[PDB]
From a paper:
The extracellular region of PfEMP1 comprises multiple adhesion domains called Duffy Binding-Like (DBL) and Cysteine-Rich Interdomain Region (CIDR). Nevertheless, the rosette-forming PfEMP1 adhesins described so far, namely IT4/R29, Palo Alto 89F5 VarO, 3D7/PF13_0003 and IT4/var60, belong to a specific sub-group called groupA/UpsA var genes and, interestingly, all four present a specific DBL1α1-CIDR1γ double domain Head region.
The Head crystallised only in the presence of heparin, as found earlier for DBL1α1, with the best crystals diffracting to 2.8 Å resolution. The overall shape of the Head is rather compact, with the CIDR1γ domain folding back upon the DBL1α1 domain, thus burying a significant surface at the interface. The interface between the DBL1α1 and CIDR1γ domains is stabilised by several charged interactions (D367-D654, N381-R518, E389-Y521, Y437-K550) and, furthermore, a significant hydrophobic surface on DBL1α1 is buried within this interface. In CIDR1γ-VarO, this region (residues 496–570) contains a twisted antiparallel β-sheet composed of four strands (β1-4) as well as three short α-helices (H-2, 310H1, H-1), forming an N-terminal subdomain. We show that this region is surface-exposed and critical for RBC binding. Importantly, the blood group A binding site and the major heparin-binding site that we mapped previouslyare distant from each other on the surface, indeed on opposite sides of the molecule.
Author numbering: 19 to 716
């Protein structure tokens, strides 16, 4: 049981000491002399100068140690983009195919470019192809400016920045930037921000010139059997020589009390004594620049997930569970502390809606996070298999080999190290214990986002709230007693969207099936019945692991269904859109689309029939009918509603009356009751399928 960073470092040294075992004969041709660097910006060119640095990397200024001759950056800043807050809880990683090398749509496995990498300080490196950049020295000073300013940003933005304890976290983030800078220099970096590829294109042009500048012996050595230059080899070395200098400009801003720590294969403690992340100590305390990018990134992803999850949960606790301050709420937004409870009062607006707002958000993050953990898990397998399979060579092989030689042969053994990370391990509560080998619990929706205990809670002076049993029994029950038209139960099954199915798949398979329209559908068999003055719904097929609550109110259920309907309606309108396009364009694949929609459409039509069947078992007062409940919900949720529906405003004020059914509520003297938004939305969507069905027919 060791940390993933400690292990990846231990493997890294074995690679580093292998590089320095051999004494480079051409070392002096690749070692850069800072003082010797030549830079020319727009003003420098205007005024007719060539700026040089002094000895100190710590006295480097972007206004003079840059080649930036562009219009956009007149300030000549190394950080010029969305490089504002990388440690933000809402800062996103990138896992798609377009902006990553090796990540391709087809293969489900993908590496995740952390926010910190996405916004590195290399805008000055986009300027490397020019008449003044032709030496090992020039290049170093460019890497040196980048390292300084990037190292600055990390220190003046870090969460541990003001921390009372040890500032170890700052060094760790620098080590991450250092390694990423290295992979950039080397040509090894996988992030492709734009097809322009200016750092990499320029970085090529520099090394081509460095190569010609070399001696015949050195040129012959850094060459390919065909005579061509082994630019790859040239570049990995240039990094090994210069890396000490790159670590100085980086740690140039690091605080006195920040020290890079790491443990040995045995368990020996390695620390940077002098301080400032080992700034005045020479040789770097890190070997992370000798760890493949993917692993560094995965270890970063895990460590940031664990960190932000603590922030996210705390924001959820703030709106849903602060018993010390008489706070207790449902994820369906109801104050459980209340004497007279809003959760069984169907027409009543919701008290505590900030809780529901927090839960929806938290859930959406945890599922974004889950998708990333799935993608990376698959790539770790793709990479750990690749080493045994391929006979030929690539730079990473040697590392992945060693990893398999340690117990970390498979994903499960490695995910154990991810659990042991500084942030992931730090939990004195087994409620929020992180086990990446238990994706179910670790990617679960918070326990604070559960429905109110049906009877409510009564808070105490002691700083906690207690679950009351059969609370306020028959108190003001005389009023709703006459409003009970049917006390029999009503059973129906509902097709809830469970998108956590693409990932987790082996664990879910049994309970969640993928539909045509969704990569996950959860069939919930409900029994709704009026007991006392509260209509409770029981989940027949209840599974704690996958379903949140066993018992809910009918009001809670309706709104869940209504949330789900809109979502599904949106998805449907989306999948049917190319076929619906007015132009009489024949498409074969369109037939299977409309059939899919009809599959979901019909299910819901059948679903709602049963839900109205339960609604009508109670009287809420004339005009306080389901058509009005549907409007009330759609009004109070105008954001979501506008994203799903085409013209809500015309629908909201649409008066269509239908046959008055068996529905006890219909007390209208032979008059026909008005169609609800749900029924009109379905019956409208239907006509759209009927059109498509006959617009792609043989
Ligand atoms: Mg690609
Ligand atoms: Mg299926």
């Amino acid at each position: 049981h060791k940390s993933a960073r400690n292990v990846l470092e231990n493997i890294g040294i074995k690679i580093y000491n292998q590089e320095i075992k051999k004494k480079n004969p051409y070392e002096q041709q690749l070692k850069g002399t800072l003082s010797r660097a030549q830079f020319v910006d727009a003003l420098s060119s205007r005024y007719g100068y060539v700026r040089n640095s002094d000895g100190n990397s710590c006295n480097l200024d972007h206004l003079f140690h840059t080649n930036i001759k562009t219009g956009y950056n007149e300030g000549r800043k190394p950080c010029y983009g969305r490089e504002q807050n990388r440690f933000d809880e809402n800062a996103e990683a990138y896992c798609n195919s377009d902006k990553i090398r090796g990540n391709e749509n087809n293969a489900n496995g993908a590496a995740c470019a952390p926010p910190r990498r996405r916004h590195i300080c290399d805008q000055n490196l986009e300027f490397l192809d020019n008449k003044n950049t032709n030496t090992a020295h020039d290049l170093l000073g460019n890497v040196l400016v980048t390292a300084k300013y990037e190292g600055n940003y990390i220190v003046n933005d870090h969460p541990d920045k003001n921390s009372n304890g040890n500032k170890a976290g700052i060094c760790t983030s620098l080590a991450r930037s250092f390694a990423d800078i290295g992979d950039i220099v080397r040509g090894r970096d996988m992030f492709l921000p734009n097809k322009d590829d200016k750092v990499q294109k320029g970085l090529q042009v520099v090394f081509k010139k460095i190569y010609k500048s070399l001696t015949p012996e050195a040129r012959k050595h850094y060459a390919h059997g065909d005579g061509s230059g082994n630019y790859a080899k040239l570049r990995e070395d240039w990094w090994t020589i210069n890396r000490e200098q790159i670590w100085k400009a980086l740690t140039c801003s690091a605080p006195y009390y920040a020290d890079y720590f790491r443990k040995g294969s045995d368990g020996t403690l390695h620390f940077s004594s002098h301080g400032k992340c080992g700034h005045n100590e020479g040789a770097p305390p890190t070997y992370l620049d000798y760890v493949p990018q993917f692993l560094r990134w995965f270890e970063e992803w895990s460590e940031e997930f664990c960190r932000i999850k603590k922030i996210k949960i705390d924001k959820v606790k703030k709106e849903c569970r602060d018993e010390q301050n008489k706070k207790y709420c449902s994820g369906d937004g109801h104050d459980c502390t209340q004497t007279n409870l809003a959760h069984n009062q169907i027409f009543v607006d919701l008290d505590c809606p900030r809780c529901q707002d927090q839960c929806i958000k938290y859930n959406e993050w945890i599922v974004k996070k889950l998708e990333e953990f799935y993608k990376q898990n698959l790539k770790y397998s793709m990479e750990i298999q690749k080493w045994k399979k391929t006979k030929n060579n690539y730079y990473d092989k040697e590392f992945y080999e060693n990893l398999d030689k340690k117990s970390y042969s498979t994903i499960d053994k490695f995910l154990n190290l991810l659990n042991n990370g500084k942030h992931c391990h730090d939990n004195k509560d087994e409620k929020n214990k992180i086990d990446f080998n238990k994706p179910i619990k670790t990617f679960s929706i918070s326990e604070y986002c559960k429905t109110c205990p049906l009877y409510g809670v009564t808070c105490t002076n002691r700083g906690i709230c207690i679950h009351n049993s059969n609370n306020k029994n028959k108190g003001e029950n005389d009023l709703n007693k006459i409003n009970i038209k049917d006390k029999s139960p009503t059973t129906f099954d509902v097709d809830m969207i469970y998108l956590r199915r693409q990932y987790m798949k082996n664990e879910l398979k049994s309970f969640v099936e993928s539909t045509c329209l969704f990569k996950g559908m959860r069939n919930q068999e409900w029994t709704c019945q009026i007991l006392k003055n509260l209509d409770v719904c029981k989940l027949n097929n209840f599974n704690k692991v996958i379903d949140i609550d066993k018992h809910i109110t009918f009001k809670v259920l309706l709104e869940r269904w209504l949330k789900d309907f809109l979502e599904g309606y949106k998805k449907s309108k989306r999948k049917i859109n190319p076929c619906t396009k007015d132009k009489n364009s024949c498409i074969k694949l369109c037939i299977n689309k409309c059939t899919c929609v009809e599959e979901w459409l019909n299910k819901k039509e059948k679903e709602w029939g049963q839900i109205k069947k339960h609604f009508n078992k109670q009287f809420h007062g004339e005009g306080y009918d389901i058509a009005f409940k549907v409007k009330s919900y759609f009004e109070d949720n105008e954001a979501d509603v506008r994203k799903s529906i085409d013209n809500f405003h015309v629908l909201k004020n649409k008066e269509e009356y239908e046959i008055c059914n068996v529905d006890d509520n219909c007390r209208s003297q032979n008059n026909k009751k008005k169609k609800d938004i749900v029924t009109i939305l379905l019956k409208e969507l239907k006509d759209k399928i009927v059109s498509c069905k006959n617009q792609h027919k043989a």
